C-alpha cells in the first residue's frame, strides 16, 4: 500500500479509540488552538477595550476575577467586523488590549465545532448507522453560531458577540432584552418550550423506563446490574410503561411504539432549539419581539398599562444604563 | 483581592472530604475477591 493510502486508512479507521476522520483533521487542530488560547486568556489576559472607548474591562483570573465574573472579553468596537489576527497587530500587547484572543478563539471554535458535526456524520457512515445524530447537534451548533457570529454580523461588531464567560453571558442576555425584547419574541418562546419540554420529557422517559425495569437483581444490589451491555432482550416492559402512562393521561396520549417515542424525544428539543437559534439570528437583523407598549387605551385616550408596559419599564432601565460611556447621540441604532 | 480568609480552607475541605470518601469506597471495592 501507498504511504498516502495507509494514512487515509489510519485517518478513517474504525478502530482508533477516538475517531479521527477527514472532518477530524480540521477539528483537532482548530479545537486545540481555541482551547489553549481560551485557557491561557481566561487565566492571564490583561483588560480588553471591548467597547472601543479606551475603557478596558478585566476578564482574567490574575487580573481580579473569579470563575463567575471571569471571561475572554469580545474584541474592540473600533475593530467592528474587521478580521484581527495576531499578525495584524503591531505587538502582542496591542493584540491583547484590543481583544484579539476573542476572535482567535471564536473562529477556531466555530470551525472546529462545525467539523465536530461533520465527524458525527462521518463515523455513523463508517459504522453502518443511520446518519442523523449530526442533525440533532446542529441545534446547539446553530445557537453557538447565532451568538458568536450572526449577531455580531447583523450589529456590525464582534464587540457585540457573546463574551466567553459566565457573567459576560448574563450581560449579553440583559442587553439583548433591552435591545430586542427577546422575551416577547415567539421564537425565543419556542426555544423555552423546547428546553423546558426537553427537560420534562427527559424526566418523563427516564422515570417511565426506570418504573418498568424487569426484576433481575436482589434488594441489596443496584437494579443497574440487571442489564448486561449488549444483551439481546429489552430490559424493561414497555407494555407496562404504556399501561401506566396511558392511564395517567388517557390511552391515546401514550406511546407504545418505542421508535415514535424516541423520534419525539429527538424532535421536540431539537426543533425548539432551532427556533431559539433563529430567534437570535433574526433579532440579529433587528426584527424584534412583539411591542405592545401603550397598546391599550381608554375612551379618553389615557394609556392603560398592561404587563407589557411593565416589561418596557424594566427594558428602559437596562437600555439607559448599558455601556454608560459609549453613546453620544440619542438613539442606540446598533 | 480581599477575599474571605476562610474561602481557601472551605474549598479545600469541600473538595477533599467527599473525594476521599469515594476513593476509599472505590479502592476497597477493587481489592474485593474478584
Amino acid at each position: 500500500a501507498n504511504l498516502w493510502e495507509r494514512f487515509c486508512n489510519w485517518v478513517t479507521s474504525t478502530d482508533n479509540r477516538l475517531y479521527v476522520g477527514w472532518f477530524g483533521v480540521i477539528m483537532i487542530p482548530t479545537l486545540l488552538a481555541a482551547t489553549i488560547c481560551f485557557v491561557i486568556a481566561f487565566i492571564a489576559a490583561p483588560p480588553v477595550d471591548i467597547d472601543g472607548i479606551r475603557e478596558p474591562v478585566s476578564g482574567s483570573l490574575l487580573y481580579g476575577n473569579n470563575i463567575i465574573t471571569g471571561a475572554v472579553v469580545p474584541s474592540s468596537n473600533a475593530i467592528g467586523l474587521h478580521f484581527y489576527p495576531i499578525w495584524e497587530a503591531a505587538s502582542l500587547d496591542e493584540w491583547l488590549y484590543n481583544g484579539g484572543p476573542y476572535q482567535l478563539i471564536i473562529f477556531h471554535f466555530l470551525l472546529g465545532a462545525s467539523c465536530y458535526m461533520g465527524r458525527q456524520w462521518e463515523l455513523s457512515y463508517r459504522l453502518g448507522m443511520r446518519p442523523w445524530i449530526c442533525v440533532a447537534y446542529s441545534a446547539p451548533l446553530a445557537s453557538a453560531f447565532a451568538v458568536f457570529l450572526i449577531y455580531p454580523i447583523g450589529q456590525g461588531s464582534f464587540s457585540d458577540g457573546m463574551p466567553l464567560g459566565i457573567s459576560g453571558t448574563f450581560n449579553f442576555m440583559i442587553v439583548f432584552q433591552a435591545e430586542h425584547n427577546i422575551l416577547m419574541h415567539p421564537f425565543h418562546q419556542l426555544g423555552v418550550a423546547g428546553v423546558f419540554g426537553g427537560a420534562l420529557f427527559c424526566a418523563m422517559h427516564g422515570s417511565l423506563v426506570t418504573s418498568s425495569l424487569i426484576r433481575e437483581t436482589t434488594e441489596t444490589e443496584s437494579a443497574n446490574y440487571g442489564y448486561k451491555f449488549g444483551q439481546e432482550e429489552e430490559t424493561y416492559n414497555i407494555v407496562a410503561a404504556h399501561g401506566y402512562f396511558g392511564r395517567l393521561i388517557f390511552q391515546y396520549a401514550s406511546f407504545n411504539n418505542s421508535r415514535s417515542l424516541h423520534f419525539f424525544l429527538a424532535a421536540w428539543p431539537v426543533v425548539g432549539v432551532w427556533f431559539a437559534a433563529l430567534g437570535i439570528s433574526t433579532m440579529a437583523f433587528n426584527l424584534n419581539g412583539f411591542n405592545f407598549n401603550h397598546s391599550v387605551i381608554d375612551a379618553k385616550g389615557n394609556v392603560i398599562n398592561t404587563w407589557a408596559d411593565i416589561i418596557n419599564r424594566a427594558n428602559l432601565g437596562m437600555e439607559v444604563m448599558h455601556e454608560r460611556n459609549a453613546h453620544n447621540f440619542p438613539l442606540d441604532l446598533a | 483581592m480581599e477575599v474571605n480568609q476562610l474561602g481557601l480552607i472551605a474549598t479545600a475541605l469541600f473538595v477533599l472530604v467527599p473525594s476521599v470518601f469515594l476513593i476509599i469506597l472505590y479502592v476497597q471495592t477493587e481489592s474485593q475477591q474478584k
Binding site: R17, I43, L61, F229 | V3
Partner: peptide, 30 residues
C-alpha cells in the same frame, strides 16, 4: 491564592477527563 485554587480545580477536572476516557472500565459483551 484564589487564582491557584480555581486553576487547581480546573486542572483536576481535565485530569479526570483523561482517566475517564482512557482508563475507563471497558465495555464488554458477556
Amino acid at each position: 491564592m484564589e487564582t491557584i485554587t480555581y486553576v487547581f480545580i480546573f486542572a483536576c477536572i481535565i485530569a479526570l477527563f483523561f482517566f475517564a476516557i482512557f482508563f475507563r472500565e471497558p465495555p464488554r459483551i458477556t
